[PDB]
Amino acid sequence: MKRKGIILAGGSGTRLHPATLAISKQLLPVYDKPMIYYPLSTLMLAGIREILIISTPQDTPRFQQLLGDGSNWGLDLQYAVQPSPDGLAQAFLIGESFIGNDLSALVLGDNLYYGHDFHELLGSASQRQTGASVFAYHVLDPERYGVVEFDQGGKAISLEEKPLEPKSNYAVTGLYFYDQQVVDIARDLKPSPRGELEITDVNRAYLERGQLSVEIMGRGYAWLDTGTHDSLLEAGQFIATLENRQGLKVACPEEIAYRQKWIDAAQLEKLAAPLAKNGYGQYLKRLLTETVY
Amino acid sequence: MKRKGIILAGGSGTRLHPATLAISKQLLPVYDKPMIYYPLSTLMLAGIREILIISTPQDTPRFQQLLGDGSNWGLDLQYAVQPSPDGLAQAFLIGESFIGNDLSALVLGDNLYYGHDFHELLGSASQRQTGASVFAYHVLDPERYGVVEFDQGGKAISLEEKPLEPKSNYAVTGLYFYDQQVVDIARDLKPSPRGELEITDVNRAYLERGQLSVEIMGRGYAWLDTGTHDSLLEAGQFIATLENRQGLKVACPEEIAYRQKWIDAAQLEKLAAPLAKNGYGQYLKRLLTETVY
Amino acid sequence: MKRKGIILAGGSGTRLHPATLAISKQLLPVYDKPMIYYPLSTLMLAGIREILIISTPQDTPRFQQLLGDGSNWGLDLQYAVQPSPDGLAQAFLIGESFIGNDLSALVLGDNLYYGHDFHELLGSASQRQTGASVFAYHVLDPERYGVVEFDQGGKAISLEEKPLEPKSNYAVTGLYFYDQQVVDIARDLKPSPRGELEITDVNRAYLERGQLSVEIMGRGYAWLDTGTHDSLLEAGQFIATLENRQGLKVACPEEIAYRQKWIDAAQLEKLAAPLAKNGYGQYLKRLLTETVY
Amino acid sequence: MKRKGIILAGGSGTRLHPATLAISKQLLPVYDKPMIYYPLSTLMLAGIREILIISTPQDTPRFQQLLGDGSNWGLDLQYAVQPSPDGLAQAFLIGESFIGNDLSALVLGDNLYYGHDFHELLGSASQRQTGASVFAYHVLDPERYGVVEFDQGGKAISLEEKPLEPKSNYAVTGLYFYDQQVVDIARDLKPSPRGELEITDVNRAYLERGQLSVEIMGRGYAWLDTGTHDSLLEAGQFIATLENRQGLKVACPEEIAYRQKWIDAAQLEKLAAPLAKNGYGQYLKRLLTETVY
Ligand SMILES: CCCCn1c(N)c(N(C)C(=O)c2ccccc2)c(=O)[nH]c1=O
Ligand SMILES: CCCCn1c(N)c(N(C)C(=O)c2ccccc2)c(=O)[nH]c1=O
Ligand SMILES: CCCCn1c(N)c(N(C)C(=O)c2ccccc2)c(=O)[nH]c1=O
Ligand SMILES: CCCCn1c(N)c(N(C)C(=O)c2ccccc2)c(=O)[nH]c1=O
Ligand SMILES: [Cl-]
Ligand SMILES: [Cl-]
Ligand SMILES: [Cl-]
Ligand SMILES: [Cl-]
């Protein structure tokens, strides 16, 4: 059974205005590449090739201009709009027709992940054909996120959205895997006191049915914060330190497509040509003639 | 006599693609605010209130959405397009009608400046009603810029554009002041071997007429580099270290307009309202009730 | 069979003078803690509790003052000096008596490692009772290190020390695992043209006997550079970004001792007391009453 | 009349333990050079050549090894110890004999300053032969420092030490200038509730005699924070961004001595020799054959 992906790349309201007045946050580069390249690359590593990008009406065309129909990276990209920022769960109403009867995965357009064995850690969620799979990650400021409580045996027993008195320091990350129940669960959701359709209600419903796998994303992964000006900066520094150390890029979509065998060496060469006079183009070229373990 | 300003915020070509595929560089934020805020604030400190923003046809509307007509900050902003990126000196052909018979100033949309007595250092160029005035700044990599050579008495005697063997480490910054000759000098320029109308030829012409002042911008000023992904990241770290230290913002246009008395406390309050729930709105508010020396 | 550890924390000569005039590099903190805490914590994760710290004669006492005999963290630390910086392999002559007839592991005092499953990746070297095990990591500037060449089947076939024309981009990291042959191999080493006893000759000898495992340390690990002022800075930024994101520390020795069960909750509490008024002390306290996966 | 300088580089207690367990904070490098180089360079710019370095008994020899007697940079450096960290005003009891009957200046060993016209701003305090002169600098967190309150005419009217409800955002920096009364005012001070002899009481006494000048250090100066591990890291990023941009170093003592004519080109060359194979030596060399305005 094939899994469809959704990147929700919608409005951060005015919270980061004026930095984000002219353009939506997920088109801003983090270091050497546009933000959206990072969650897209995540979906690609989880093996997902059919992807719906959801964003504001102003910006959809900009995302289209940047990513096209995906055919150049061996993907099949489609697009849809979120008129008003009415909750992350709204993705599933908007995405209903695109999901159809398949399994799905939702990733937040501004969430960056890095680490070892990231294929395998996604795999284990990607290969469960039933229920929902989310990830929990220790953070300093759990109040800002969805907080998962574990019992003494490490079983997930409550989820709470931006709690004033968090039950743990474990935050739900912005990567979610779902079966064919998600749309129907989404459709029955009531708005919350904040006026939002919450992804935590979606995930609570799977918990109450005993069908939520909460997999731990360990301290040895980077899950980076793009929610303040400060953190956005920390992230660029973080990526640039890795890339300049290794001479290898994090979350380069072309490279993921090439290594998954979704495009061949001739196609990778054609993608490199129009950027040949810069580092990124030069990087794509070098991938054709280097073995990387 | 009054001086008109031009901010050239055009195409950086593909040099910073794909970071810049969705949006032009000068809309990317540096730390808490869009890039273009920094040179605009510079022109404001130099006392210039009538400014032409030149940009690509695709992005003009994004600059317009961000900056409007300037009326809100006591300015008068106008807009023009640069269909093709044919050299910085092109700004004077495109800007001819807007300049009319006045004095002018040109600033690169991606140049950030910071330091003490910046009013005074601009002033001394802004007050010279005849000839041209540029600024020379010691850098490590002068080969990337226009290099000014001085004789033993500190007189400027040659200018050279991206010389392979620079005569000094003094680079010409991207702030230029000009009298009513610039348009005519611009009109007579032939494209260079690179296919560009070079600002260094413009400035050489003033030097050959003995009408170029080259004022030193000292080491105690920051002139920051936004030309690589690395330097852009250095620049955000730099502004954010200053701002978090001081609780005062660098190159905030509203604050410059308020302190120059181009807008009053009532108007500053109205600008603060629609961002009240973020740091930038809160910062504008606090300016109404703090004396800053 | 038990494995003994050596941290070589010797002289970086004058290369980073004057930053390092007053103190050896491995006592400088990286972000919140002294450099040496990082490789020490690495040895601890590999399960090694008996450790020889080797350093200059000036600085040994400072290392002793900082780390004591280890008894407080469940280790057994001993100390020895390297009079002159005559090569990394010299560690084994100096360490001969301390090694005795056991297996060993050598870590460079200035090498930082971070990532997921780091226990397991060390384990696989730690559990091989015969031969030598090193790690290879893709880097941009292989000329600076020991470069390992692989054949088309991914077999290690040459090692070369700071080659002018590197055969790959794979660098040998500064973590090494060795059987009872290392001392005797070390003793037979000739100085090189540079006047050094090279760790690459030690490792070449194991390769020529077919007893070198070269395990790949993947792009999903951080191996950080502390060899320039710039990289040292990049590292602090890197650690601080992780720690402030997670509210968990990288390479805190006390925490590793506590989680390996080498000290109990009462002892961890006593270590926290004298630092109670700062973040580090507060962090140790919080480890007593939080479950971390 | 001539002015004597004191750099207090004592115990920061345990506040930054364990980072600082092996070595006192003021020997840690900020980017390319030891911390203490920055305030020492400040005293040098203020024209002061006779300087007492006060530090802990354990570290004095490390400061001596780094700085010698100063003869190499045209200074005269002397050393004293501070057995217990009993307040910044203690510097005048300890320093009594060294001060003798001269004017003085006190600078905190961990305070970094940068900006334009820094000579002039010091000058104006250095030239006032009577009373005391301090500097007030706008900060975000004035509650951590001595806060100066101004009346509507910009006259200083109260000073308060770490007030919970600060009267302004103007913090007193860690650079102080004093006449021959300071010793006697110091001697009459009683310890505060915290067990410290406060520099703010010293400065309040001069205010109550009408002899305190409070000069504004403007926003266009950097006064950097070295009090947390975070800020220390910000400070290195900050210096390194300036230095890599300009190819000129901030607070290099040899360069200040050379430009003040306290050492000649032959002596500067001899200081450059023993570091010739690193950037800092190369930088000193290049100063012999470049004009810097
Ligand atoms: C399946 C090939 C994946 C190889 N790879 C990576 N594992 C990574 N790594 C280490 C990653 O952690 C990573 C992060 C986000 C999305 C995909 C991979 C990467 O950045 N680029 C890659 O080409
Ligand atoms: C009317 C004087 C404005 C005072 N002022 C500044 N001088 C600055 N300074 C210190 C600046 O360096 C600055 C830089 C570029 C353009 C304008 C000001 C500032 O950032 N914000 C300000 O409000
Ligand atoms: C065996 C407990 C190890 C748990 N742990 C870590 N895995 C790490 N991590 C993620 C590491 O990557 C790490 C790095 C160097 C040395 C030891 C662990 C850490 O920093 N601190 C820890 O307490
Ligand atoms: C004799 C004048 C020295 C010129 N000079 C400086 N002004 C500085 N500047 C810009 C500085 O801000 C500075 C800061 C602290 C102490 C001394 C100089 C410098 O870093 N190095 C220098 O050689
Ligand atoms: Cl982990
Ligand atoms: Cl200056
Ligand atoms: Cl990996
Ligand atoms: Cl100023």
Automatic annotation (TrEMBL), chains A, B, C, D:
It catalyses: dTTP + alpha-D-glucose 1-phosphate + H(+) = dTDP-alpha-D-glucose + diphosphate. Its EC number is 2.7.7.24. Its cofactor is Mg(2+). Catalyzes the formation of dTDP-glucose, from dTTP and glucose 1-phosphate, as well as its pyrophosphorolysis. This is Glucose-1-phosphate thymidylyltransferase. InterPro entries: G1P_thy_trans_s (IPR005907), NTP_transferase_dom (IPR005835), Nucleotide-diphossugar_trans (IPR029044). Pathway: Bacterial outer membrane biogenesis; LPS O-antigen biosynthesis; Carbohydrate biosynthesis; dTDP-L-rhamnose biosynthesis. GO terms for molecular function: glucose-1-phosphate thymidylyltransferase activity; metal ion binding. The lineage of its organism: Bacteria, Pseudomonadati, Pseudomonadota, Gammaproteobacteria, Pseudomonadales. Residues 4-240 form the Nucleotidyl transferase domain. Belongs to the glucose-1-phosphate thymidylyltransferase family. It comes from Pseudomonas aeruginosa. It holds the Pfam family NTP_transferase.
